[PDB]
Amino acid sequence: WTATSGSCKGRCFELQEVGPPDCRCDNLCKSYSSCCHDFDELCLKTARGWECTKDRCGEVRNEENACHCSEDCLSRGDCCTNYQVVCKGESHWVDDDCEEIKVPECPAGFVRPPLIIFSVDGFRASYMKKGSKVMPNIEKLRSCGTHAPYMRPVYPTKTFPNLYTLATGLYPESHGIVGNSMYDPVFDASFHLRGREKFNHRWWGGQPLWITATKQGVRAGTFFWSVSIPHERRILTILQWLSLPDNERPSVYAFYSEQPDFSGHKYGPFGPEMTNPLREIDKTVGQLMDGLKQLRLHRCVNVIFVGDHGMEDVTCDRTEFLSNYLTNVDDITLVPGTLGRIRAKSINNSKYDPKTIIAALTCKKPDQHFKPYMKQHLPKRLHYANNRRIEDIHLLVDRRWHVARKPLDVYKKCFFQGDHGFDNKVNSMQTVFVGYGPTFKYRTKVPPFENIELYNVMCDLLGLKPAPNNGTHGSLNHLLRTNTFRPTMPDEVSRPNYPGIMYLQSEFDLGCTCDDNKLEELNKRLHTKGSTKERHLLYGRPAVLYRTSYDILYHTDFESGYSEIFLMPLWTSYTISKQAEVSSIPEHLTNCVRPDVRVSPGFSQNCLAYKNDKQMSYGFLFPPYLSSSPEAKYDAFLVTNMVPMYPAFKRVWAYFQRVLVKKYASERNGVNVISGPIFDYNYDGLRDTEDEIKQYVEGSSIPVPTHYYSIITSCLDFTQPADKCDGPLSVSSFILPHRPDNDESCNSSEDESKWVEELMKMHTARVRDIEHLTGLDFYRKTSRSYSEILTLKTYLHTYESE
Ligand SMILES: *[C@@H]1O[C@H](CO)[C@@H](O[C@@H]2O[C@H](CO)[C@@H](O[C@@H]3O[C@H](CO[C@H]4O[C@H](CO)[C@@H](O)[C@H](O[C@H]5O[C@H](CO)[C@@H](O)[C@H](O)[C@@H]5O[C@H]5O[C@H](CO)[C@@H](O)[C@H](O)[C@@H]5O)[C@@H]4O)[C@@H](O)[C@H](O[C@H]4O[C@H](CO)[C@@H](O)[C@H](O)[C@@H]4O[C@H]4O[C@H](CO)[C@@H](O)[C@H](O)[C@@H]4O)[C@@H]3O)[C@H](O)[C@H]2NC(C)=O)[C@H](O)[C@H]1NC(C)=O
Ligand SMILES: Cn1c(C(=O)NC2COC2)cnc1COc1cc(Cl)c(C#N)cc1C(C)(C)C
Numbered sequence: 001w002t003a004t005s006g007s008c009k010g011r012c013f014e015l016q017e018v019g020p021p022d023c024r025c026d027n028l029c030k031s032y033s034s035c036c037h038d039f040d041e042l043c044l045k046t047a048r049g050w051e052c053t054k055d056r057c058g059e060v061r062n063e064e065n066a067c068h069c070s071e072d073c074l075s076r077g078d079c080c081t082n083y084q085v086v087c088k089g090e091s092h093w094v095d096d097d098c099e100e101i102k103v104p105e106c107p108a109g110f111v112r113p114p115l116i117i118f119s120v121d122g123f124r125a126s127y128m129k130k131g132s133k134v135m136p137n138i139e140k141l142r143s144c145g146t147h148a149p150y151m152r153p154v155y156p157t158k159t160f161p162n163l164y165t166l167a168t169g170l171y172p173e174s175h176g177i178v179g180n181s182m183y184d185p186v187f188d189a190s191f192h193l194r195g196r197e198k199f200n201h202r203w204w205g206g207q208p209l210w211i212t213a214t215k216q217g218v219r220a221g222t223f224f225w226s227v228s229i230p231h232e233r234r235i236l237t238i239l240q241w242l243s244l245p246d247n248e249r250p251s252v253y254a255f256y257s258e259q260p261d262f263s264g265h266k267y268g269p270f271g272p273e274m275t276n277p278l279r280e281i282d283k284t285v286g287q288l289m290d291g292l293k294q295l296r297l298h299r300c301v302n303v304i305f306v307g308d309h310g311m312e313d314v315t316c317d318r319t320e321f322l323s324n325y326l327t328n329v330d331d332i333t334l335v336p337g338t339l340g341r342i343r344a345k346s347i348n349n350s351k352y353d354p355k356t357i358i359a360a361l362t363c364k365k366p367d368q369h370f371k372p373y374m375k376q377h378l379p380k381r382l383h384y385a386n387n388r389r390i391e392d393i394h395l396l397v398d399r400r401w402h403v404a405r406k407p408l409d410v411y412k413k414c415f416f417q418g419d420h421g422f423d424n425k426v427n428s429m430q431t432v433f434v435g436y437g438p439t440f441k442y443r444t445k446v447p448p449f450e451n452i453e454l455y456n457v458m459c460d461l462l463g464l465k466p467a468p469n470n471g472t473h474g475s476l477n478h479l480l481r482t483n484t485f486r487p488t489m490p491d492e493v494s495r496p497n498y499p500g501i502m503y504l505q506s507e508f509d510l511g512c513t514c515d516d517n518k519l520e521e522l523n524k525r526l527h528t529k530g531s532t533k534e535r536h537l538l539y540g541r542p543a544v545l546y547r548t549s550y551d552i553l554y555h556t557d558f559e560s561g562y563s564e565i566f567l568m569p570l571w572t573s574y575t576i577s578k579q580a581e582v583s584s585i586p587e588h589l590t591n592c593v594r595p596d597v598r599v600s601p602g603f604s605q606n607c608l609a610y611k612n613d614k615q616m617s618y619g620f621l622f623p624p625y626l627s628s629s630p631e632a633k634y635d636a637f638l639v640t641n642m643v644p645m646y647p648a649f650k651r652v653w654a655y656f657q658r659v660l661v662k663k664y665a666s667e668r669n670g671v672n673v674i675s676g677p678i679f680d681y682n683y684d685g686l687r688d689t690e691d692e693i694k695q696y697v698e699g700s701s702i703p704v705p706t707h708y709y710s711i712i713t714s715c716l717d718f719t720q721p722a723d724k725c726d727g728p729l730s731v732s733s734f735i736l737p738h739r740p741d742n743d744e745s746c747n748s749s750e751d752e753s754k755w756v757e758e759l760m761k762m763h764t765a766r767v768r769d770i771e772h773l774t775g776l777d778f779y780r781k782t783s784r785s786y787s788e789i790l791t792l793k794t795y796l797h798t799y800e801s802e
């Protein structure tokens with residue numbers, strides 16, 4: 001209950017709440033059924049519309065008008081945005097030439113350039129080129145400011161996950177807004193876009209920008225706009241706030257547009273009906289920039305024009321129905337559409353089986369347009385698992401499709417021609433970034449980047465210290481003229497041991513066997529002491545950022561950091577030149593495993609455990625196939641180079657090592673490879689401590705990895721060899737799930753040449769993702785700036801067309 005007969009007089013769009021039961025005149029009051037009786041009359045004026053006409057110039061103020069053309073309007077801060085154009089012979093901001101903003105040009109009393117975030121729902125990246133003819137304001141922002149060809153949203157590519165990611169710098173798994181609908185099980189509560197539940201603060205984790213600002217003494221405008229407030233009024237409201245006195249004026253503001261998403265769902269992303277929504281958003285940008293320019297703020301404010309997600313062609317007929325797969329389809333609840341999430345209709349059902357549900361959805365029809373996953377098996381790049389609101393069973397749905405429980409769900413709601421929410425790598429889901437203002441660069445194109453990165457930058461733009469987030473602070477310094485964040489490298493926590501030969505062969509009882517001139521006797525000593533190390537370790541040794549015991553082992557062909565705790569390398573580094581030769585594992589060396597006389601029996605793996613473990617086999621991190629010489633090949637069979645591998649997974653690994661490494665070296669003019677295990681048994685994206693490991697090689701202390709990674713680096717200028725590169729680098733990385741079956745790959749019964757590389761592409765990763773999962777820090781010794789390296793560590797190779 002509210003006493004909704006106080007008044008909004010003098011308080012329209014007041015910046016602080018007032019506590020029920022006073023009545024409200026802030027922006028949310030509609031949404032809580034709580035505005036004062038006179039809110040619409042006083043605060044939502046519409047009389048005479050939104051534009052000055054010659055006949056209104058110098059009018060007598062009439063307080064009923066929506067905006068003013070009276071001589072007093074600039075000082076009252078409430079002119080129509082086109083007032084100076086119509087009534088003082090001024091030019092529209094869009095008609096003015098682009099002129100570099102080297103320094104903020106602000107009115108007196110401004111402590112810092114304000115930031116305006118202008119968010120557009122469903123604004124797909126390719127609209128910047130495809131709609132360029134009808135968005136002149138937007139195109140000027142883009143060509144004169146700083147822009148990316150596109151910005152990568154987070155998964156799922158839905159509105160609230162992506163805008164709350166923008167505001168927090170956090171993955172949805174961490175901020176808690178994991179879809180446009182959710183069910184929390186420890187709230188028996190359901191979040192939806194409709195309704196009032198979404199407004200409860202319990203859903204919304206992390207620390208959004210407006211709170212970071214407020215806590216550090218910087219005031220914020222509203223970020224949520226009620227749907228019934230028209231855009232023209234949202235803009236006038238921002239401009240009025242900007243005329244407040246210094247002690248009261250916000251420094252950060254947001255404007256949100258429901259378009260073009262709203263029309264896109266109806267008409268498809270490039271429907272003829274889409275030209276007009278783009279025209280209209282452009283006009284609204286025009287109103288803001290003309291308003292800023294009247295208030296002498298157009299060379300003072302930093303503007304970010306950003307989208308939440310794109311839009312794809314999706315229709316009712318492209319719907320897969322779980323009823324066509326399952327018989328038990330009334331025992332489940334599906335969160336449906338462009339992704340699926342499945343749980344049990346009732347948790348008084350000890351006879352509901354995830355395993356049987358997954359099997360019943362796996363590779364069941366030849367062109368099946370979704371793929372089931374347990375959430376912990378989803379590609380690690382999606383970061384979509386470590387939250388109780390994300391159901392254990394997930395369906396990744398093909399672009400252009402939907403999933404539904406039963407047909408009646410689809411005709412008892414074709415309506416719609418567009419949708420979004422697919423995998424964030426999909427071209428049609430990419431969205432936009434433009435930064436314009438004194439703090440951004442002038443006429444600069446930057447590479448595509450992820451929206452998780454923007455919170456740090458917005459904090460930098462406002463002089464705020466960011467709360468802990470998933471951005472990599474520094475990775476976007478190249479967007480900025482000034483206000484850059486001087487990142488430094490994390491300190492190494494554990495220093496390596498450098499063991500020599502300390503053990504005689506007979507001290508080992510590992511149950512292994514192998515079948516095994518003075519000029520090249522010094523030669524091999526030199527190799528075991530790190531003579532080839534400049535070649536195989538090109539960017540320094542990775543730093544270990546936690547407390548552990550590990551040894552650097554040198555070899556002719558590869559260098560490794562060997563963990564005494566996990567009994568296997570944390571990392572193994574090797575360089576394959578364009579000219580390198582692939583060779584086989586000789587018949588006599590098929591089962592060869594050799595004790596390493598540098599490492600104690602008690603810190604070694606053993607072959608018996610692998611013999612006794614009927615599920616578990618082993619592979620090698622430096623591949624024997626890429627040995628430089630028959631003699632060097634013996635090094636690849638050291639027990640220190642061995643890692644546990646499911647036979648099923650060995651098919652993937654062997655193909656990668658035997659065929660694909662050499663392909664990449666030939667295509668990229670050599671490659672440096674760093675490979676290793678990852679342990680993420682609690683699927684939190686972070687390196688497991690050893691007491692978190694849930695699986696060991698039977699009857700041993702050898703832990704089984706959940707994943708294997710590789711980082712593959714070369715020269716960006718591919719005319720230079722990887723090992724003699726003078727300038728910027730090029731990387732691609734992956735985090736492959738270490739699974740005992742290849743059920744993920746529907747074509748796995750075929751030759752590896754038809755499915756393996758497809759799997760690896762799906763599991764493409766950023767170097768930064770591997771950093772989180774290993775506690776390692778890469779690229780510590782290069783000739784590049786640290787900022788550039790941070791950019792490199794955030795790169796994702798997406799394997800999409802353009
Ligand atoms: C992306 O960036 C983010 C942000 O930096 C990274 O997330 C951080 O990860 C840290 C490590 O996992 C984590 O630190 C823990 O936090 C506990 C304090 O938690 C509360 O307070 C903070 C501060 O204001 C708050 O942010 C937290 O918010 C979470 O919880 C609420 C729900 O209750 C949500 O509204 C919100 O969205 C957020 O949810 C997310 O995080 C939780 C975990 O915190 C997940 O479960 C959710 O799914 C969701 O993702 C909290 O309100 C603190 O108590 C922890 O300390 C214990 O744990 C460690 C052992 O690992 C140990 O050192 C301590 O001694 C202690 O042990 C004792 O507690 C154990 C557990 O109760 C118990 O088992 C033991 O036996 C002991 O009793 C710990 O410090 C930090 O909170 C999150 N922050 C966020 C915002 O998510 C994320 O890792 C990054 N991702 C990548 C991939 O890099
Ligand atoms: C999405 N939205 C709606 C909306 O969906 N209305 C629907 C339900 O009724 C019709 C209304 N106003 C907004 C803008 O919100 C934001 C904007 C920005 Cl720029 C940022 C940031 N950073 C964050 C948000 C939040 C507050 C979502 C987190």
Ligand SMILES: [Ca+2]
Nearest residue numbers: 121122159308
């Ligand atoms: Ca949206």
Ligand SMILES: [Ca+2]
Nearest residue numbers: 680686687688
């Ligand atoms: Ca973990």
Ligand SMILES: [K+]
Nearest residue numbers: 610613614616
């Ligand atoms: K075995």
Ligand code: NA
Nearest residue numbers: 742743745748
């Ligand atoms: Na298969």
Ligand SMILES: [Zn+2]
Nearest residue numbers: 122261265420
């Ligand atoms: Zn939408």
